[PDB]
Amino acid sequence: KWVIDPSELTFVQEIGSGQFGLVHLGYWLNKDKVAIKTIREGAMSEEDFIEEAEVMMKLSHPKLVQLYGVCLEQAPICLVFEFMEHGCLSDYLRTQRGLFAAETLLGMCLDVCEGMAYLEEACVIHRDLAARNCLVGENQVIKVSDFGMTRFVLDDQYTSSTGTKFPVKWASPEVFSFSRYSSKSDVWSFGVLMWEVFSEGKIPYENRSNSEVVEDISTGFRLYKPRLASTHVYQIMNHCWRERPEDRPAFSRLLRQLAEIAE
Numbered sequence: 001k002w003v004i005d006p007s008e009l010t011f012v013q014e015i016g017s018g019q020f021g022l023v024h025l026g027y028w029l030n031k032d033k034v035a036i037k038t039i040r041e042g043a044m045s046e047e048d049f050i051e052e053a054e055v056m057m058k059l060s061h062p063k064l065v066q067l068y069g070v071c072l073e074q075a076p077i078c079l080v081f082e083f084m085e086h087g088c089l090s091d092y093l094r095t096q097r098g099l100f101a102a103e104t105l106l107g108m109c110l111d112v113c114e115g116m117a118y119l120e121e122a123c124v125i126h127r128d129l130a131a132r133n134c135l136v137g138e139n140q141v142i143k144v145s146d147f148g149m150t151r152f153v154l155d156d157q158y159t160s161s162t163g164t165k166f167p168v169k170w171a172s173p174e175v176f177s178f179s180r181y182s183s184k185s186d187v188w189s190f191g192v193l194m195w196e197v198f199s200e201g202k203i204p205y206e207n208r209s210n211s212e213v214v215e216d217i218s219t220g221f222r223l224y225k226p227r228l229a230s231t232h233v234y235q236i237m238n239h240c241w242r243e244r245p246e247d248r249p250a251f252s253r254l255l256r257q258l259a260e261i262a263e
């Protein structure tokens with residue numbers, strides 16, 4: 001079962017304040033050390049989420065952060081995850097900027113691509129893949145997290161393509177125009193994630209408003225090549241950013257292409 005009783009969790013340390021509430025380091029009885037995220041009432045559709053728990057608990061892969069269960073006896077509810085010692089990838093890149101070998105950056109992209117190839121095979125769409133949603137664990141392994149969560153977020157300004165907070169910087173044209181999500185729209189986001197990795201955590205299109213990103217992308221403009229990305233790596237990024245989803249590679253194809261580049 002995915003229901004975790006309150007008596008089975010102990011909070012040890014406050015890790016920080018997230019988007020939906022607090023994050024603690026804690027222990028899960030007879031199981032493991034965990035990250036526990038407390039979710040503010042009203043931030044998510046909890047009833048919708050728990051309906052998918054029996055199916056979603058079956059997903060398991062070394063490059064996906066495991067969400068073990070939910071503590072829901074009383075509000076605010078808690079989501080219990082595998083603990084990722086080095087935190088989010090975006091902050092990890094920014095704090096260690098100048099210390100990364102190009103091979104390590106390519107390895108980080110390969111970990112994410114492997115996790116995404118598993119989700120693509122499982123027919124699970126991430127919808128908001130970005131360096132901020134990837135986590136860094138033991139021996140600098142990168143794992144994907146928060147896949148599918150935007151289907152439960154209750155803030156319309158974030159989830160609607162016409163919303164003032166829409167994450168347009170990672171959105172393919174069919175997502176920013178029609179919310180047409182697919183594993184091919186996640187491939188576009190993955191190309192932006194590759195750019196974030198090779199730029200050591202720079203913000204994509206930092207000098208543009210949301211409408212300006214939409215105009216730039218629709219007129220064929222793309223993110224410039226980061227200094228650390230080889231021309232072969234940048235070519236792959238551009239394949240992720242093809243206007244037509246049908247022309248983008250599947251994650252299964254990207255994984256083989258990037259591994260050949262690495263090895």
Ligand SMILES: CC(C)Oc1ccc2cccc(-n3cc(NC(N)=O)c(C(N)=O)n3)c2c1
Pocket residue numbers: 015016017018023035065081082083084085086087088135
């Ligand atoms: C909550 C964030 C803003 O603050 C921190 C501060 C320090 C951290 C140190 C280590 C790990 C962190 N950490 C741990 C996380 N989750 C899991 N599954 O372990 C996350 C996350 N962003 O989801 N960040 C940390 C997160």
Ligand SMILES: CC(C)Oc1ccc2cccc(-n3cc(NC(N)=O)c(C(N)=O)n3)c2c1
Pocket residue numbers: 002049050052053054056057058059060064065066067068069070081144145146147148149
């Ligand atoms: C207790 C969990 C399995 O319940 C759910 C319920 C609904 C979900 C809907 C979309 C995605 C889910 N989801 C998200 C997960 N992991 C992270 N790191 O976000 C997992 C997992 N199996 O690791 N499942 C869901 C997980």
